[PDB]
Amino acid sequence: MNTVPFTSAPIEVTIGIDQYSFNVKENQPFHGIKDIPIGHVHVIHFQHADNSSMRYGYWFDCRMGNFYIQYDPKDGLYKMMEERDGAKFENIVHNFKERQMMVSYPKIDEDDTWYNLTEFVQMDKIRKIVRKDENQFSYVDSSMTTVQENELSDPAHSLNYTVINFKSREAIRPGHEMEDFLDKSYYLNTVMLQGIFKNSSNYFGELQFAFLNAMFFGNYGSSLQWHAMIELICSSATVPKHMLDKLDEILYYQIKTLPEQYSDILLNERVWNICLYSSFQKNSLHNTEKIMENKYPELL
Amino acid sequence: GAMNSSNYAELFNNDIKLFVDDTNVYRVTVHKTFEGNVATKAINGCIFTLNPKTGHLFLKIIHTSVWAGQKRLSQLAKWKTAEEVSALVRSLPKEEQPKQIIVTRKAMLDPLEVHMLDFPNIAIRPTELRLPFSAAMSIDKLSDVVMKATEPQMVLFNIYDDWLDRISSYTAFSRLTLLLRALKTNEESAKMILLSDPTITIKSYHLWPSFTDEQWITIESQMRDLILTEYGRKYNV
Ligand SMILES: N=C(NO)c1cccnc1N1CCCCC1
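The joint structure predicted for all components is written out below.
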């Protein structure tokens, strides 16, 4: 179990760590988060109490370095930094733990939620969607746009998601116009899976990362990407059975975790009604369809 | 964006554009089978592709063999239309290619957009105008070439005959739209109006009769009366 210490907490802020959130008061004696499970990526995220504009946060993996948080009063944000001095870091952490100045990561033993949301998410792939090679953690915020969005300035502040566009020469083989537009299997299996992602694990990793950025930061371009990656599978007549079963599990846990009061802004009615009720895969997502109908029947 | 009454003069500017109407591509008669079920029999159709500035009509005849063994024909018909329009564009010299293609039905937008991906600079537009181009098969010479076709064929016409020698393309299009709306609302009466006087004939190389300017005014008035007459019969006004 690893630790992200904080130098201090000089401004009042709501701090998220994965699916949990808690409030820290201005100058309250808070020195970080302990007991972070090893083996998963994690995100530590922030919304200032005096300006809820800009949610921002960090993707990190404690196996890749010793990370800590320090407020910068110039740039006006809790900045994540790597500590290269290991014995300094261990000594800092041990003292904060002894003084019980840290929150413990609240993981319930039965609870696989975070695993289920990040099953295919790897730091190395996050570091390619968000490019800052100098740093071992990734910084994301509510306002960052995507490469596709910039087709319709510092490179690290753009999300390099894989561009998906159903009316594009990449998606449509000359001479198979109707076939490829009404059945996206070519675009899914040959162009995207075989050609770009290499395997379904990397595709699902990007889909899960897009969802989490949409949920945790309200990042609109990430929400667009999440839905596009769902629609691409649902609109393909030929999808490996293991991919369909895994997609159903992925989406179930995403819909289960989504805050009920954000469903209006985080869920696209057209995509979900098409995917669940009209698409080739309308009968292949039993768990997702059941939770959607019981939790968000208005949308449908 | 969409083409409506606010931007009607745009049809007659110097930017090449084509209307595409697909309402006569897939045509059927519905009938009973020996067992008392219902079946369809396709008949020859046509794509109506019109330059409203010049009158040039690219009439692609859709022979019933293109439907043999296919499913979901009403959907296929939209994609076949888009394939043939794309092939037509590619066959034209660059300086003759349209800058815009206006589809008369919004269901043609995605099929045509996908087929024209290679032409990112050609705008594909819908229209809010309700244009009576479905009545094209009420023009006898057009219906005749479609029904006689034994294979796919493209035939080029000028739908304005020689009218542009005397009137503008705005006035020519308005005449055409009035004639077609009349033929669509009451075909028998419209044809009676157009052919009642045996002394006015249709030249071999034309589609409509050889009316003088003053006779066109009478004809046009008789067509408006027909449209109003049928509107009263329809709504009991
Ligand atoms: N917050 C960061 N590291 O602590 C960071 C990392 C990478 C890219 N931009 C970053 N920030 C720097 C502060 C201003 C907002 C953008």
